[PDB]
């Protein structure tokens, strides 16, 4: 049974619904971007249309083998008609493809949806800024004021810094980073910048960032292990008994790994501040785990909803308790009240 916060009403259709079957009564089922929990469902037999931006298509046809007469991408920042409605995609600021969506409404009502989204400044000069917008379905995911980090560019900057002094004190160090996911591709990017190296990684990783359109990705990625001193491994591996064995297969090229886990928030966050992050170690390795987020921390949420105004709020995290629920009504009355919409 397809949930309400992912049908779009007066239309035809659904939004990141395809693990319900055939949803009655939907034209066009949207997928705002390629993560699993989104696309659950998709495979090589649906047979639906499939509405979504350029490079979540590019991993429809490539990885999920969808077929291509089924996949619809649409460009950014562009009106478009779609089953006699008009719609817009905006860039999310989330992984990369991942899209929020604007829908005109027959009637006259306008709805965004924001998909998964990190709220920017930038967002209040799109296309949001032209009209007004009547419903919300909103990424809820960290709704609550203890969920505070840094920025993407602080953190990058205490990345690069880490393993530049690392590898120059040490030239046969290397270093890993846990991937389990498209997104946060800036890491390990960044990184072998730095070093002068190009990332390492097996064939079905190299096969996803292929289809990111990622400029100039063939000088900054390659599936030659032994060339690279920048390596991506699961996110499951990167732990003592992982990276020891890791280490076992370079053949003696190397006799330390600094290693990067890049998570969402942890409580750590609530005590320490980047500057002052430290990692766990054992012996000749050592992990850090990093604040890197793709979701939009309370105050970029908050700022966001007080610039936007709308007249009724849906969220599309946290939405499976009565304590999550009335918390997050509760902070949405709060930011109406202090702004006066
Ligand atoms: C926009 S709001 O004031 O924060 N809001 C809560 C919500 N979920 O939108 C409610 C206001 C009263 C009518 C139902 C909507
Ligand atoms: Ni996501």
Same mark, same amino acid.
């Given at each position: 049974?397809c949930?309400?916060?992912?049908?779009?009403?007066?239309?035809?259709?659904?939004?990141?619904?395809?693990?319900?079957?055939?949803?009655?009564?939907?034209?066009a089922?949207?997928?705002?971007?390629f993560?699993?929990?989104?696309?659950?469902?998709?495979?090589?037999?649906?047979?639906?249309?499939?509405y979504?931006?350029?490079?979540?298509?590019?991993?429809?046809?490539?990885?999920?083998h969808?077929?291509?007469?089924?996949?619809?991408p649409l460009?950014?920042?562009?009106?478009?008609?779609?089953?006699?409605?008009?719609?817009?995609?905006?860039?999310a600021?989330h992984?990369?493809?991942?899209?929020?969506?604007?829908?005109?409404?027959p009637?006259?009502?306008?709805?965004?949806?924001?998909?998964?989204?990190?709220?920017?400044?930038?967002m209040?000069?799109?296309?949001?800024?032209?009209?007004?917008?009547?419903?919300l379905?909103?990424?809820?995911?960290?709704?609550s004021?203890?969920?505070?980090?840094?920025?993407?560019?602080?953190?990058?900057?205490?990345?690069?810094?880490?393993?530049?002094?690392?590898?120059?004190?040490?030239?046969?160090?290397?270093?890993?980073c846990?991937?389990?996911?498209?997104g946060?591709?800036?890491?390990?990017?960044? /990184? @072998? %910048? =730095?070093?002068?190296s190009?990332? !390492?990684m097996?064939?079905?990783?190299?096969?996803?960032?292929?289809?990111?359109?990622?400029?100039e990705?063939?000088?900054?990625?390659?599936?030659?292990?032994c060339?690279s001193?920048?390596?991506?491994?699961?996110?499951?591996?990167?732990?003592?008994?992982?990276?020891?064995?890791?280490?076992?297969?370079?053949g003696?090229?190397?006799?330390?790994?600094?290693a990067?886990?890049?998570?969402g928030?942890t409580?750590?966050?609530?005590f320490?501040? /980047? @500057? %002052? =992050?430290?990692?766990?170690?054992? !012996?000749?390795?050592?992990?850090?785990?990093?604040?890197?987020?793709?979701?939009?921390?309370?105050?970029?949420?908050?700022?966001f909803?007080?610039?936007?105004?709308?007249?009724?709020?849906?969220?599309?995290?946290?939405?499976?308790?009565?304590?999550?629920?009335?918390?997050?009504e509760?902070?949405?009355?709060?930011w109406?009240?202090?702004?006066?919409?």
């Amino acid at each position: 049974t397809c949930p309400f916060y992912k049908k779009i009403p007066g239309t035809g259709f659904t939004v990141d619904a395809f693990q319900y079957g055939v949803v009655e009564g939907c034209t066009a089922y949207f997928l705002t971007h390629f993560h699993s929990d989104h696309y659950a469902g998709l495979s090589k037999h649906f047979t639906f249309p499939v509405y979504c931006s350029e490079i979540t298509g590019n991993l429809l046809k490539n990885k999920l083998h969808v077929q291509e007469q089924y996949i619809h991408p649409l460009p950014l920042d562009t009106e478009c008609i779609v089953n006699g409605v008009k719609v817009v995609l905006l860039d999310a600021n989330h992984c990369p493809g991942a899209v929020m969506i604007l829908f005109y409404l027959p009637n006259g009502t306008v709805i965004l949806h924001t998909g998964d989204f990190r709220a920017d400044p930038s967002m209040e000069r799109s296309l949001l800024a032209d009209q007004k917008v009547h419903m919300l379905y909103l990424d809820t995911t960290y709704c609550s004021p203890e969920y505070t980090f840094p920025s993407q560019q602080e953190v990058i900057r205490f990345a690069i810094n880490t393993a530049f002094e690392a590898v120059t004190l040490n030239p046969h160090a290397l270093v890993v980073c846990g991937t389990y996911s498209i997104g946060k591709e800036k890491v390990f990017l960044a /990184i @072998a %910048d =730095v070093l002068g190296s190009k990332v !390492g990684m097996s064939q079905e990783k190299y096969k996803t960032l292929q289809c990111l359109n990622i400029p100039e990705i063939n000088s900054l990625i390659t599936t030659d292990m032994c060339s690279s001193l920048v390596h991506l491994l699961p996110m499951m591996q990167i732990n003592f008994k992982g990276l020891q064995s890791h280490l076992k297969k370079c053949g003696g090229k190397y006799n330390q790994i600094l290693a990067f886990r890049p998570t969402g928030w942890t409580h750590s966050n609530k005590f320490t501040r /980047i @500057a %002052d =992050v430290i990692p766990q170690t054992k !012996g000749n390795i050592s992990i850090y785990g990093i604040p890197y987020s793709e979701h939009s921390s309370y105050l970029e949420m908050k700022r966001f909803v007080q610039w936007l105004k709308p007249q009724k709020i849906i969220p599309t995290v946290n939405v499976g308790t009565w304590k999550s629920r009335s918390t997050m009504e509760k902070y949405f009355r709060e930011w109406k009240l202090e702004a006066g919409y």
